[PDB]
Amino acid sequence: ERIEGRVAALQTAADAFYKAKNEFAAKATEDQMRLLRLQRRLEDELGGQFLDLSLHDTVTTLILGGHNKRAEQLARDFRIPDKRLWWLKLTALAD
Amino acid sequence: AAHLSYGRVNLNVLREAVRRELREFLDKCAGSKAIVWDEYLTGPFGLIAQYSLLKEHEVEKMFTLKGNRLPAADVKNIIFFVRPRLELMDIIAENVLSEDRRGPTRDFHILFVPRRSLLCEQRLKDLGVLGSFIHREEYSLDLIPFDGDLLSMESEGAFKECYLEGDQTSLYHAAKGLMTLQALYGTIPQIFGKGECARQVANMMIRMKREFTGSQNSIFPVFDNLLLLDRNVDLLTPLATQLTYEGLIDEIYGIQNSYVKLPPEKFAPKTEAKKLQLNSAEELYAEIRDKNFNAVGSVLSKKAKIISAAFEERHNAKTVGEIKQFVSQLPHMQAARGSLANHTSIAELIKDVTTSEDFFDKLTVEQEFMSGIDTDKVNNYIEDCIAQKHSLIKVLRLVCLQSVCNSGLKQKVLDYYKREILQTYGYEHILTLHNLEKAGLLKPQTGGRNNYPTIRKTLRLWMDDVNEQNPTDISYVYSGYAPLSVRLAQLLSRPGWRSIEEVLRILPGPHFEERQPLPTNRVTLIFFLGGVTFAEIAALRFLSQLEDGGTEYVIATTKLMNGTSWIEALMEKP
Numbered sequence: 001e002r003i004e005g006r007v008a009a010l011q012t013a014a015d016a017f018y019k020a021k022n023e024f025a026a027k028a029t030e031d032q033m034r035l036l037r038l039q040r041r042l043e044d045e046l047g048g049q050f051l052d053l054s055l056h057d058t059v060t061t062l063i064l065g066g067h068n069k070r071a072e073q074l075a076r077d078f079r080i081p082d083k084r085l086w087w088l089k090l091t092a093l094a095d
Numbered sequence: 096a097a098h099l100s101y102g103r104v105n106l107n108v109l110r111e112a113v114r115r116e117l118r119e120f121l122d123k124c125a126g127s128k129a130i131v132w133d134e135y136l137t138g139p140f141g142l143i144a145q146y147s148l149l150k151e152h153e154v155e156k157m158f159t160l161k162g163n164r165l166p167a168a169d170v171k172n173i174i175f176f177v178r179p180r181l182e183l184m185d186i187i188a189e190n191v192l193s194e195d196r197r198g199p200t201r202d203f204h205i206l207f208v209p210r211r212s213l214l215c216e217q218r219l220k221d222l223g224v225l226g227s228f229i230h231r232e233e234y235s236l237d238l239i240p241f242d243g244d245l246l247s248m249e250s251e252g253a254f255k256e257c258y259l260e261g262d263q264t265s266l267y268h269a270a271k272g273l274m275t276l277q278a279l280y281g282t283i284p285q286i287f288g289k290g291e292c293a294r295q296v297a298n299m300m301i302r303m304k305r306e307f308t309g310s311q312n313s314i315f316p317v318f319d320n321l322l323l324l325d326r327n328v329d330l331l332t333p334l335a336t337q338l339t340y341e342g343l344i345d346e347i348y349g350i351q352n353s354y355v356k357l358p359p360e361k362f363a364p365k366t367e368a369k370k371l372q373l374n375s376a377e378e379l380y381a382e383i384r385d386k387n388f389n390a391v392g393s394v395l396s397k398k399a400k401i402i403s404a405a406f407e408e409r410h411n412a413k414t415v416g417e418i419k420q421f422v423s424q425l426p427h428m429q430a431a432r433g434s435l436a437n438h439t440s441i442a443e444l445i446k447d448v449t450t451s452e453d454f455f456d457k458l459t460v461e462q463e464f465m466s467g468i469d470t471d472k473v474n475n476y477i478e479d480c481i482a483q484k485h486s487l488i489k490v491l492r493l494v495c496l497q498s499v500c501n502s503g504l505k506q507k508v509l510d511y512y513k514r515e516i517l518q519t520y521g522y523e524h525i526l527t528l529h530n531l532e533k534a535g536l537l538k539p540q541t542g543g544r545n546n547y548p549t550i551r552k553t554l555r556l557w558m559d560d561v562n563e564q565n566p567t568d569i570s571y572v573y574s575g576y577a578p579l580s581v582r583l584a585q586l587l588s589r590p591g592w593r594s595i596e597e598v599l600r601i602l603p604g605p606h607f608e609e610r611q612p613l614p615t616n617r618v619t620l621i622f623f624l625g626g627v628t629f630a631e632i633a634a635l636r637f638l639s640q641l642e643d644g645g646t647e648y649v650i651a652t653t654k655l656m657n658g659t660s661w662i663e664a665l666m667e668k669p
Contacts, residue, residue, distance in 0.1 A: 054519060
């Protein structure tokens, strides 16, 4: 129940960016809704905090907690290109 | 302050007038005082008056404005120094109504800065405390002198307010600022401008002068010209990395109210940052601040040898005669040694940054875009920085530079940059991207049309192989890039704006001219509406000191900034 309110605001915002003919904004707001929903599953399934992280920070945290299958899947779902994922992994793991 | 008088206009007249006003105000509030400060005001007020002056007017305590009860203090008077903001009126009311009634009371007063507001007073009346103030006045601190040729309002929000929010409050204060200058330094007979904001400032100047009805101004004009310039006429310059000594101190550590906070390891005695004042009162800083950073090393070596030799000369003073003299020179020798040690340590800090691989790569990219190369493809260094999650603002400066040099980016490119910025830094920054678009900094290209090359080639804005050591052109400050703003100023003075009509017509806003009637090297006052960088300032000092019969510049601005603080101010409180 805790994210229904935040999800409703984002919906109201998607609708707004569509009336406004701002296609990029609408889609981005759709992606953020999808990501917040995923973030709540992850708190539910693994505990700890994931709400409100950026996508990159979510993947990074997952890698760091040992959840490498979920992290890869998460990157594929948002079509993160190979080069950007490689850099992400490398900065996650380095001293 | 001697340095306020080193140039053409004596800015102590101005500083001393506003100090006199403050004194007169404190003297009406007789007896011991505490000042309660709207925190936003303390920094810039520091250029006008430190605690040492206030102390001589029996200010015994200084507090910050917050809610609930005021702190206990055995003083006769509490004085609020505060901006005319509605929300702050509620806090003051709470302070006043929470006084312990029993025992001797404390008289209340209020000084509104920079203006008193009928509306704020109405609010204080409704809250039930207007009648508790014995004095209510305004102190119209608009243009603050930072150096002998430099004035700022230090209004960081002006750019946003004007170009995104349609709020021209800051233009009214600029006009009022210009009226105060004309009361002290005489009427400015010629006014030139380029930009929407400029047109409004001019229109308000002229109105305010027609509506004045005091003694006619007899003062012989010190300024020959005013040039009003919209920041949005030259969006490029602030984005680029500054390459002067003062520029780089600002890029890297930030200069606030003419002080910088540095890491302390290299300084005496070595816990907290080393705080230093940077202005023209220090001979050595006057000499290197406007230089390209690659010319500074030689200057420092020369001084090291001179100072070193003076001190080495103490072994030779064996006599009673020449010990008298060496001794008389010592204070100056010690201060020159100290000044040199500081700037020598600052140069080493800047060198650690400017020799890094990341700096070299950033600059290669900046220079690629400014000279017209590949300003429409997704750029691989930007993509590496985004992937490594470098500082968001570094990334934004770079993509905005690309947009401005290309007259926008094709949809696909712009959208690709945006998606990867939101994925990496967070959806919440979509607001920052929209603001950048409305500012004209990161936007879609329209048609296939791209005008920067015509503007660049015509105004000679990029040059290769520039002299950095003995400069011959304003491009030295960015090692090749001539700031557009300064180039326009230069070309107004000689040969005149008729020669570039076709280019002005593709830059934002009108270009215009007005005269102000007078009773029966030129000095130009140049006013940046929306901010100015230290590199632009250096370039203007560079024109000022050519003894080619041109013009000398005194610089005013709404704000002293760089690309980083400019863009931070376009973001929202996350």
